[PDB]
Structure formats: C-alpha cells, structure tokens
Amino acid sequence: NSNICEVCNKWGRLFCCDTCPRSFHEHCHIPSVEANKNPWSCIFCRIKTIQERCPESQSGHQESEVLMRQMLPEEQLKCEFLLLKVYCDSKSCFFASEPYYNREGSQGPQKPMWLNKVKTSLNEQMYTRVEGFVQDMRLIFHNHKEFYREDKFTRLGIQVQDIFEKNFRNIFAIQETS
Numbered sequence: 001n002s003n004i005c006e007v008c009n010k011w012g013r014l015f016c017c018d019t020c021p022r023s024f025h026e027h028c029h030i031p032s033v034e035a036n037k038n039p040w041s042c043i044f045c046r047i048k049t050i051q052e053r054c055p056e057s058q059s060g061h062q063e064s065e066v067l068m069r070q071m072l073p074e075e076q077l078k079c080e081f082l083l084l085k086v087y088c089d090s091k092s093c094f095f096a097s098e099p100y101y102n103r104e105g106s107q108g109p110q111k112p113m114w115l116n117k118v119k120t121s122l123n124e125q126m127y128t129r130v131e132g133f134v135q136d137m138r139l140i141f142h143n144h145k146e147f148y149r150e151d152k153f154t155r156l157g158i159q160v161q162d163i164f165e166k167n168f169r170n171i172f173a174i175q176e177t178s
C-alpha cells in the first residue's frame, strides 16, 4: 500500500485498502473509514465495482436526467466519491470550512456554503436527489466568484469548480459534447 493518504498526501494513521494500494486517513475517506470490515474496500474500489457490474452505466447520459435521480445507495456513493475528488485537490482548503465575509465593496452571500457542510449533509442523508448535492456544490463556487468580484482570488473558485465539473462528468458518465 501507499504510505501517504490518497486525499491529503500526508502520512499519519492510515487505513489501507484491501483491493487496491491506496491508503486513507480515517476522516479523509468519504464515508469515514468503517470500524471493522476485513477485508475493506475503499471508495475508488466500490465505484469501479459498480461500473464493472453494469458496463452500460458508462454510456453517455444527459445532466438533466442525472440530476433528477433519487439518492439510492449507488447515487449516494457516487456523490460521496465526487466530494472526495474535490477534497483531493489542495485548493479545496479554501472552501472546506465555514467562510466569513467582511470586504470593502462586497456583501456576503445570502446562502453560504462549504465542503464540510456538504459532507455533513451527505452523512446525514439530507439530499433526496442528486440535484440537491450538485446545487450545493456549485453554490460554493458561485458565492466565491460573486464575493471576490475582480480580485484575482476569484480564480481559486474557477479552478476548484473545474475539478468538480470534470469529475461530475466522469463519475456520472455525462455525454461528451463540443
């Protein structure tokens, strides 16, 4: 197994996947690494299994259909994985914890949002459809772009949104377009 966490790239107290060489901090994995379960298979492995059991699941889909899906166990897992892919980028630090807003010439967003809030909401089964999760994720970046205006720091929101959107298209097999 790897000797660093797949998510944060640090060493520490790591749990190792039994079916692939990845390792994780307990609360870096989503969902948090399960108490018992030997063998244990990471989220990467669980997602690969879904694909392998239903090869047709990789054919192109329309976003509007994906968003209306109910949060059954496989869609729950796919959103957990997508969230984890965002945490994998180090620039996610900016969006992880609860933000505050006090900048001359700007007003804070009406509905603040952040990664750890989305993580809690998934853990608590608060989303009934994929749309709920995707709307909160996109709200993170939209709030940031609006608040930072022409400051060059707005670019961090564009960057992490791009990671989100590329992973969304990959995990939910969105039909490729020009």
Ligand SMILES: [Zn+2]
Residues within 6 Å of the ligand: 005, 006, 007, 008, 009, 010, 024, 025, 028
């Ligand atoms: Zn970690």
Ligand SMILES: [Zn+2]
Residues within 6 Å of the ligand: 017, 018, 019, 020, 021, 022, 041, 042, 043, 044, 045
């Ligand atoms: Zn694995």
Ligand SMILES: [Zn+2]
Residues within 6 Å of the ligand: 053, 054, 055
């Ligand atoms: Zn099948």
